[PDB]
Symmetry: C3
Subunit: 644 residues, 3 copies
Amino acid sequence: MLGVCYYPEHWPKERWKEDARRMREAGLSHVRIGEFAWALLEPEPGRLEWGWLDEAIATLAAEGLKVVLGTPTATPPKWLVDRYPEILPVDREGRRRRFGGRRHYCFSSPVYREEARRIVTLLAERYGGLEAVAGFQTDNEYGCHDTVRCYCPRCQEAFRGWLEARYGTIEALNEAWGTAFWSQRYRSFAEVELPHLTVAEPNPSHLLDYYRFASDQVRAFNRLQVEILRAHAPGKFVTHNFMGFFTDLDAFALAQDLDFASWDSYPLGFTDLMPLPPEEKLRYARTGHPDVAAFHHDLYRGVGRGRFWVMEQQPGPVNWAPHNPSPAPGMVRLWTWEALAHGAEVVSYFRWRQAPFAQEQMHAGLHRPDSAPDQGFFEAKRVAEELAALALPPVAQAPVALVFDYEAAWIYEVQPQGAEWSYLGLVYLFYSALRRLGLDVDVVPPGASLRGYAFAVVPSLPIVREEALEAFREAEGPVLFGPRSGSKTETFQIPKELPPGPLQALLPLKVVRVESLPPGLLEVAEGALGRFPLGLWREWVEAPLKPLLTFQDGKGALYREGRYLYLAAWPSPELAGRLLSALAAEAGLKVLSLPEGLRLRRRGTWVFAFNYGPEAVEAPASEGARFLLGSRRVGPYDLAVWEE
Amino acid sequence: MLGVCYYPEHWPKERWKEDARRMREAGLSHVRIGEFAWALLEPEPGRLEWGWLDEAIATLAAEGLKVVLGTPTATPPKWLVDRYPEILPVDREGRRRRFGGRRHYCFSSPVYREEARRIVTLLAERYGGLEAVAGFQTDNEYGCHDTVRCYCPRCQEAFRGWLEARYGTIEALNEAWGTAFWSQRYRSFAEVELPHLTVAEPNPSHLLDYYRFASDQVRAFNRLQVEILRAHAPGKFVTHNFMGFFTDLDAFALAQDLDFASWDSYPLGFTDLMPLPPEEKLRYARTGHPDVAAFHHDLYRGVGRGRFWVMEQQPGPVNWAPHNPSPAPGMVRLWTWEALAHGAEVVSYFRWRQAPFAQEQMHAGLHRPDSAPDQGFFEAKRVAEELAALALPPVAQAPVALVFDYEAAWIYEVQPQGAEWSYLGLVYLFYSALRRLGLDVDVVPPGASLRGYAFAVVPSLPIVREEALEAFREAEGPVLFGPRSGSKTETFQIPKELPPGPLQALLPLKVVRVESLPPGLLEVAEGALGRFPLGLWREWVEAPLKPLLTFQDGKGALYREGRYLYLAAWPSPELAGRLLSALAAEAGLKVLSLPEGLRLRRRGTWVFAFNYGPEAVEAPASEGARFLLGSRRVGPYDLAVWEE
Amino acid sequence: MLGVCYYPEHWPKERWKEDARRMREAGLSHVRIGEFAWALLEPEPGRLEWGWLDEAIATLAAEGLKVVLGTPTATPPKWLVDRYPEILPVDREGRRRRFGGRRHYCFSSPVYREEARRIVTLLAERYGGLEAVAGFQTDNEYGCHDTVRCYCPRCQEAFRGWLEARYGTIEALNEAWGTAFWSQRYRSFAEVELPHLTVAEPNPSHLLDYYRFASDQVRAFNRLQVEILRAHAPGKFVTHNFMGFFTDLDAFALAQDLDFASWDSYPLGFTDLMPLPPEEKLRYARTGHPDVAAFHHDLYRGVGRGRFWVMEQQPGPVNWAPHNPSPAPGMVRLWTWEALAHGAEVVSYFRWRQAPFAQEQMHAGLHRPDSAPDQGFFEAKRVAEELAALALPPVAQAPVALVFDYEAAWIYEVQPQGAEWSYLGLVYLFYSALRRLGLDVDVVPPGASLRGYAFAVVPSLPIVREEALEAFREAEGPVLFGPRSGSKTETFQIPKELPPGPLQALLPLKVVRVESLPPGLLEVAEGALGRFPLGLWREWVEAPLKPLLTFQDGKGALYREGRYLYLAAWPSPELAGRLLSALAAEAGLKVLSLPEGLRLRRRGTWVFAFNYGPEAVEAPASEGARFLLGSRRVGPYDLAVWEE
Ligand SMILES: OC[C@H]1O[C@H](O)[C@H](O)[C@@H](O)[C@H]1O
Ligand SMILES: OC[C@H]1O[C@H](O)[C@H](O)[C@@H](O)[C@H]1O
Ligand SMILES: OC[C@H]1O[C@H](O)[C@H](O)[C@@H](O)[C@H]1O
Ligand SMILES: [Cl-]
Ligand SMILES: [Cl-]
Ligand SMILES: [Cl-]
Ligand SMILES: [Zn+2]
Ligand SMILES: [Zn+2]
Ligand SMILES: [Zn+2]
């Protein structure tokens, strides 16, 4: 199913009927509206004007379109901000932000909590029972513009309450943080402040708990809205639109209070911001890196416990990246089918028509400002026509699972120890390695069952809790643990047994020292798998095990015991590919050496081939395969679907 | 005529007579003093000490030197600052600046407005009628050190008043800014704040009006002083010293209240700061890029409605650039003759003698700190001797006009959409293209008559007002419009007809999409003019017109209809040169393919050839040409003047 | 003698006896403790708990270990900070810092002065007479984390008092600073503020006095503690641990109140932060640049009037650099013997055991967190065993002296005039030049006698006082003055006679102009010494002297008159090496062209050869030389000691 993000409040009411009609002709079935309409729903404090919203919903409903309503807490009215100044967030620098853009509010502000409660309850009671309404989107991209973590007075006092609940006694906190160090000892929770603007570096345990707290604050803010929607809008789904490459917010945790996860895909923008090699940045400027959208579809399908939507899909050039190219001809269609192949229930485009005013006037839509259809429109219409004839098989369990963890991201954010150490970069590297082997991937959280997977990859899991350990023990196939795994306790301390901590119950090895190396410093690690120049991060492993790969000084780089493997160094794409290929073979999985721009994704017995260009490539379809869409020869920015 | 900037207050009174005498022997006729002497004119609040200033003026007058007095509002006394703390400006970060340097005052401060009024009136009444005084310079470089835009309380309230005058009703402002977007809607002007420190990006219309307002504040501050000088100092000219590569202040607008424009040329400093290719940064380290001074002489001659002075001319190394080389031997003379060739009425050097103390102790002067003459002195004296024998012909209208616009600069500053998009860079690129063809240029504002020009170039004019449109319609020769021209309405919105907006009355084409591309991403645009790899910025043009240049995907890069041309992509120096050359030929203009370091400028029937080095070059003088200065073979850092 | 930094308060009391015992078995004789224990010594305001400290000292004393006690003023308890908020420092940006790390206090705070006085007096009275205590370390690394210079209210008022003492009358200050410039004139000391956040650049004289003041504040704070230790702890030495590449604090001045200087060596961390050529950054990642530790041993031996300790020695990877490699096998031993060869009385390692919690949990120690001995332990034990059999000859005067000056650093920090101008970089360049010639170096301050030196090098001495001049006049061998020497008066003004100012009494030459050039801009300076492409900085010298090296334009680059030489340009390593080699030969000193990774240092008749790798090299030992340690063939990361 296809949808679109619409803003009735940006156009003359006369255009509404025409818009709704063309949305239906285009083949769209869902429409999202209202997330930025607070100032229009309540221009004056207490004076509610539902007139236009009732009409807009009515207009869309008349064309048989399902409405997705978003609560408007992302952008509170200027009068509300002026009334309660405490609502405005304070950056890490200590400066109070201002009205003028969006997301100018703090998750700790108790006043904003009540203001949100009020408007959401009103909205929920009024439209909660409508048949035209299919569900809601809470707020809009929690955390965008670095807003998950706030540094105002409200946060400091809220942080103390959080800490007391977690530790009970200030004594437990002192021990956990190791406050004897640098005379940081606290006499009471009242003495603890936010971990910012400290002389020298702040305490890692202190900073991590702050990150945990910040994320929890967002979930609490969201939970409030979900409770209201469940009480006054029964039967209507509730979701939230997560972002690409964003870890400040624990999406796994927050999604527990949702019916399914949704996310906003802008491949070109993410790619322009990614530090890719020179050649790739140019090659994928108009397509996005081949795995940029796919990684997130897999992640969010996992975050949504198997269900997710692409609430916002790029339909043309955006406005916020340093460089904003136009998607190449056919990419909007490719991204759409890709999302669907990865299991997206709905792919909704942002937005229906390009706005001629304000901040995002340069952000394209399915239509230009003069209402003429833009390139994205024709591509979406095409997908609608193709989809009508192609009911999709169900999404099956992928052969490989990738264990992703938000907490891990916070830990490495707090203590990189190596300037080039990157959690997302490490995760992405393993992901692309699997993808280049033609393998489908399921992203899951620590503790989730690995039952049924041929093998699993854990880019890095610094903290290994009992639940996670159990899931690993019950694993039916091999599990590869990345560097720094099990290197921290829950309180951000080095395990008494040293890394890999709890994992030592599975692997008889100890990391006695780690190194972060300057770029360019490489040393070959070699063995039966091959020869691999490696750098950036290296660990000294003490173990009775014969390493599978050894550096020139004789130190091991990769170890294995039973079904468990441990990588003691930052992997290169080459090593990741060969190691993963070897595991796939051992598991009886067939693999393909896909060319640089080709990607595959299965759905049932069907196989989708997406060509990110710039030249045509042949789809590795079995002989006699029956093509449902496209042909064996896949042109650039094009695709193919067949029965394998 | 030649002059110099002098600081009597920096030297023992005994040196004054000797200085005045040597200024006359050197051949100087004008001397500027007093812009930084407030603390010396009023060391105690209310206690005026004109003793030294009366004597200094007397001393200079005795040698027959014309005095140019500058009002001292650029640097208010520490006691005045301590009295009225509101005077101190606040940076974009929200921090209050302090005394210690200069320009530490806000243009909005109503108190400073009165303090300025007072000191200027006193100064004007006392010296306004003196025969020794030829005129005044108001303040000193408005905006230096990013001081045009202030973010204190005074600015916020002053901005509201400005907005109400411009829009009348808050309704008109909401519509203009499109405040429905992100619930930015305002109930009254009282709710509008300064467009800074907002979460996410501020509204472009909001930010643009703030820039318009900031510039207007400076003009108002200046207008006050001009009114006083016109009332108490009749017959005495009034000017201001503008800066190189500075657009925060609308020089065209402010200069309307002046008799002529003046500017401060420091080629070496501007060049070290310019992002030039590696080879050029080294080649022109001691000379300045060949067009750095020339572009500004042309710009300011236009800003001054045909009249301008170089109030400050670099005579040796400066102190403020990351790298401060010495001008190569002969460059001070070259820069001086160049300024004169471009029509400068007076070329005044900063400064007479290098100060041995304070911030600019490393800034050279015509004399070293021990009073011995420095290299600049001999070069200036030489120009004086040469000039005495060479009365100059009048400045004629250039064959080509370049339409420059400060408002355009603000728009692109507010919305670059592409990280490498640069208004000054685009302007400079077209300028150097014309200059390398040996063509003289006149810089004019939008709306100014293009009557008499062979053809005109408009690097980019986002907003096209009726007056500008009219000037284009009445154009006698071709007009080339650069990318993004006519892409915005006065309220920073996309024209209903889409770009190029009003220009569509002249060119039947529409820009339906634009792209900003990462550096290195190039695609050949080809046609009869040649083959040109282009990047950075590209536009999709919908039109019945057959493009003159076409990209590999078939999209047009350059269009023409009648006398109007439109460039839909960022030009390379190669394209700019060939396109401009083709236009010159069509207009019957003769062109020359000047070598990299050679530049020409005419004055009457005379032609000046300036060689920026590093090696000698031949001046392309017609046969039998009569040389007034130099020879056909122009050594590096040297020049030639002949009758063509 | 060898020692270690220990933190009893970080481990269970049960481990104390075992630790003390193993410290003795390892061969250690000194142990430092207590610098970060304030919060443990006084958890409650007024409640002193010396229990654990008495026991720890007792435990260490029982093994026959000498205790080095550090006063705990570096990290004041959170309750003390909460009580007196004024204690917290304010950064240059104007932001108040917070508790959470360390060094969160201001040197100006009069309240903290008394709090320090109290705790230090208590500590001194209680342990001052113990036989187990050998001495004290005041605070801990004054200035770490840019804390020497503070910008709070206390500093502003303290700065005024300082200024009045130095100048007497505001008139003398106005003249010294040249406040006539930009109307900076002051009516009284009360009007002078801190030189920060000024519009445009602050006055150099103003900023320099602030730097002088800031350093003096630290010495005063330290002097207080020294007075207390001399009164209540007679016979016990007093020292302080200075840092590498840190000039904010005048170590020469402060060390006058100490018995000897101490410093903290972390070669890997300093090197990763040094801007070395690509090849060297990789080659020395695990060893540190060959001269990084040595330069500081020489500097601090000089700062300590001939006596110094390495209070903290890197024993493994650290946690604070962008990249933290492990020292290569044998480097801890090499660094230890190197320090001893340079005269270090004691080499104390930081730290005994790696902490499993807090900020430096990734900072290695002699033991891992599980108490197992780490690589550094075995290397230190080896040095202990080797040292026992090798009593060392006394340190003799080096053949060459290098004149280092902290004030010079402040001047160039205030006025680089060239972006790449670097005082430490210039000093280091001359130092490495001498070191590559196999020459030993003594670092001394201006004014110190140069009697006995073959020749001396003065990288740069902007201000030349009478004492310094006298020392130069009495020099027995040649003295080489680097660029910008004698270019400033004590009040940061250009000497009336122009640079090199007072040095013109020794050299008949004047610097009439200087240039700072962009990187890549090079010009050959040539003469009998060779041909040298030079750049970055160049001076125009007016003199009757025939330059020894001349640029292509005929301007001199190097001059000499009698025993005095003057370099008018930034030297390349090649020029520094040849110039220094020529001077050594003339002085009858023998020199060696040591390979890139080899370094030598003598002690008595012994010669130490340190090989920084990566490959083996031959020690240039005279024939028949008797080796005390190692062999003629020195493996990488290894060393040799022999009788020459
Ligand atoms: O591409 C820009 C988009 O970024 C987010 O997805 C946001 O939710 C949208 O409202 C829009 O601003
Ligand atoms: O080159 C430095 C100069 O910069 C501006 O031109 C200013 O007006 C002068 O006073 C001087 O500071
Ligand atoms: O290597 C890190 C070290 O830095 C300084 O030397 C400090 O005095 C030590 O306490 C430790 O923090
Ligand atoms: Cl829309
Ligand atoms: Cl002067
Ligand atoms: Cl320890
Ligand atoms: Zn807040
Ligand atoms: Zn202001
Ligand atoms: Zn302070």
